[PDB]
Structure 1
Amino acid sequence: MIQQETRLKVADNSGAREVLTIKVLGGSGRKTANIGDVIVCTVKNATPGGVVKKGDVVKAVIVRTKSGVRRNDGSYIKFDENACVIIRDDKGPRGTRIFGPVARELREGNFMKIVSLAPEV
């Protein structure tokens, strides 16, 4: 989520339960990601029965962070949890459901399927 070793849990309907960050994309030397950034991770924990299995290397996007983000109005939003969603090649969720609240900053991006299934945006 932030570093090269952060443990991220998922909130989608896939076999994965927890992932470990491997690389932050978007430039050489970049060492920190935020909400709405794509990362490369590996599945450290998986559930019996599902599409994603343990040890698989997959792509994901960040939807919740504890540090939070700052908006142009001077307001801030912070979460109590760190979460991510495994995406497919065309920026679409591999699962069929989204759990928990999702940051409102995915709406301005091209991740619209994630916002549609999210219970609260």
Structure 2
Amino acid sequence: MIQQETRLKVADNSGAREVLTIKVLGGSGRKTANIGDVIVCTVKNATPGGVVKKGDVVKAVIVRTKSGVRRNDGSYIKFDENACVIIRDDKGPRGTRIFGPVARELREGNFMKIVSLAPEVL
């Protein structure tokens, strides 16, 4: 279950360290979201140095929720935390040394870029 007013981690090297959410865009009245989606958020802890610094508005994309998913396979993928990653109105991220695992359900997301940028993908 993901909602706004929720603390999300990053897994890139842009200059952020932790964020939380303002919104879950989409449609009028849209509440919640999971992996494969675009959000806005703001940084309550920034990495010293880096581009993106604390107290700043940002967009981002979902990865590897603990509300993992189930596919047309009839089968399931879960994690033990969540994380986000920050973008540049282009499906192009700022930090470019992505850590940790990521899903496969974002090729459709057209972050194939990011997937090639990624470690192991699932």
Fold shared by both chains (TM-score > 0.5): yes
Contact 1:93 / 1:113 at 8 angstroms: preserved in 2?
no
Deviation at 1:110, TM superposition (A): 1.0
The alignment partner of 1:45 has SS state of: strand
Gaps of at least 5 residues in structure 2 are: none
Q: Percent identity?
A: 100
Deviation at 1:96, TM superposition (A): 1.4
Distance of 1:74 and 1:89 partners within structure 2: 33
Distance of 1:36 and 1:109 partners within structure 2: 6
Q: Which runs of 4+ in 1 moved over 2 A?
A: none
Gaps of at least 5 residues in structure 1 are: none
Taking structure 2 as the reference length, what is the TM-score of the superposition?
0.95
Distance of 2:109 and 2:95 partners within structure 1: 19
Aligned length: 121
Deviation at 1:109, TM superposition (A): 2.1
The alignment partner of 1:105 has SS state of: coil
Deviations 1:50-104 (A, max 9, x none): 1000001000000110011110011000011110100111111111111100011
Distance of 2:47 and 2:68 partners within structure 1: 29
Deviation at 1:106, TM superposition (A): 1.0
Contact 1:18 / 1:43 at 8 angstroms: preserved in 2?
yes
Task: Report the aligned-residue RMSD.
Answer: 1.1
Deviations 1:21-74 (A, max 9, x none): 000011011111110100010011011111000001000000110011110011
Deviation at 1:108, TM superposition (A): 2.4
Taking structure 1 as the reference length, what is the TM-score of the superposition?
0.96
Corresponding residue of 1:20: 20
